[PDB]
Design a protein around this ligand. Sequence first.
Ligand SMILES: Nc1nc2c(ncn2[C@@H]2O[C@H](COP(=O)(O)OP(=O)(O)O)[C@@H](O)[C@H]2O)c(=O)[nH]1
Ligand SMILES: COc1cccc(-c2cc(NCc3ccc4[nH]ccc4c3)nc(N)n2)c1
Ligand SMILES: [Ca+2]
Ligand SMILES: [Ca+2]
Ligand SMILES: [Mg+2]
Lengths: 425, 61
Amino acid sequence: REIVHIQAGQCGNQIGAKFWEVISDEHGIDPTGSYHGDSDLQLERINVYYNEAAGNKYVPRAILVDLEPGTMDSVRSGPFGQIFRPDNFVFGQSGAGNNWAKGHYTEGAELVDSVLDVVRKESESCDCLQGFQLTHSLGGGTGSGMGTLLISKIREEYPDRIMNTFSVVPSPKVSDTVVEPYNATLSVHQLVENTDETYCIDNEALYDICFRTLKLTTPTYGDLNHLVSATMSGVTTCLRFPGQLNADLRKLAVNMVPFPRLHFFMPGFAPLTSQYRALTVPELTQQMFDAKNMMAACDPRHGRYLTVAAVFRGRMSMKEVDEQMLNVQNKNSSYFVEWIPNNVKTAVCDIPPRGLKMSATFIGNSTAIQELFKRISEQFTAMFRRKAFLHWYTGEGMDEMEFTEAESNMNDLVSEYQQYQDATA
Amino acid sequence: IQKAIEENNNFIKMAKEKLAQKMESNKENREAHLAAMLERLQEKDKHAEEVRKNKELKEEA
Ligand SMILES: Nc1nc2c(ncn2[C@@H]2O[C@H](COP(=O)(O)OP(=O)(O)O)[C@@H](O)[C@H]2O)c(=O)[nH]1
Ligand SMILES: COc1cccc(-c2cc(NCc3ccc4[nH]ccc4c3)nc(N)n2)c1
Ligand SMILES: [Ca+2]
Ligand SMILES: [Ca+2]
Ligand SMILES: [Mg+2]
């Protein structure tokens, strides 16, 4: 059960690099690819994300994609730059200019075949491919436009494999350009059809967390990516380390996705870091269900949970987590749908993340994620009703009905979340 | 992508034609101006040759 990782664009490759830095440290792999760890539990599932190369060297099963070489050159020079397989760097020269059309139709189409070639070589070397994960942003052009193009191409060649994504949603408080709502709306319509799980990482929340909670006056993209890498590590701990949980991507999707289109999750993490005081199990459970620890700028009390999964890391009383986990149920029992019995899952991993005795990762399938899509839809319509900045896209061959269609599909997605939010037994 | 190519090419086509059109009409107009200027001056020279000839008839009197 191997996973193939893909990171596309500026945002996708930076959060992807941090990810490989974090889990590489947890598995005991050094920047050169040599193992110098203390426990054999680190290696029992190293194959899930790493290939074993000549010389007992471990190489991430990762593909790096971008339409301009800038960020990828930085990655090759970064701390863990030399660990990636050099032939897995696939880049163009021009770029996408924060244009979904360039990444999806013109500039990205020129490069997509070359990317799929590397996918095949990685998949052919898989004993039993389990699925794919993609890291990318939805506000730019390469990760947004070409990223969804890659997903459509992968579902063509591997139609029976799981396709999941860690997608960074744009926010005006952290914005590079104004056409970000356009690109996001066009990308989400693709994710509704061609992904099994999409973790909605909202830059609005990451900023509010760095500023309000962590008290960071001037947050940088590096500060936000520290939160993202920690969460992705927590989400993947159920596959990367050997508990008595037989977790496969498809089995996890079956347990979390009651309806095919409603597969957009709210990530969460606790404690929030950037101290030494030991955190208590009651504190971990109370923080991980708090809105201030959510990676999507949505209020869970404004919607209802379809399914929930809590992952605890460290050595703690498995009895005490159950008591506190069962306790929190009552404090928000109204916010859990009663027509999916026992819809809250709990997993425990004995291995803690770096420099934390105990941590908790939160994955929620809540109808309150609808708030995020409304926000993007509003920003979209504010411009589209005046056809502002459309020339950037029509110049690349797109028609205006493609914008209208994408708009309607997201409003449909919003309405679908609303019917189940009001549904009762 | 075919549409994108179609639009870039047409924009080049329309530009090339409209430019060629403008600079053929302009060549015609400037030539027609100087042609009329010279034809006016040449018409002056006829009246000049006529004035010389009218003096030549009365000195034969
Ligand atoms: N968290 C995070 N978000 C980013 C980063 N860089 C860009 N973004 C997001 O992505 C959007 C810009 O898209 P961009 O990264 O240029 O897409 P690309 O052209 O495919 O690389 C912005 O709205 C940001 O919110 C980063 O380093 N960290
Ligand atoms: C994006 O790629 C990945 C990669 C690795 C993991 C995941 C992931 C983790 C997860 N959390 C743990 C969990 C949740 C519900 C459970 N039920 C029975 C065991 C059990 C365990 N839940 C989902 N859906 N995916 C997604
Ligand atoms: Ca080209
Ligand atoms: Ca080919
Ligand atoms: Mg950029």
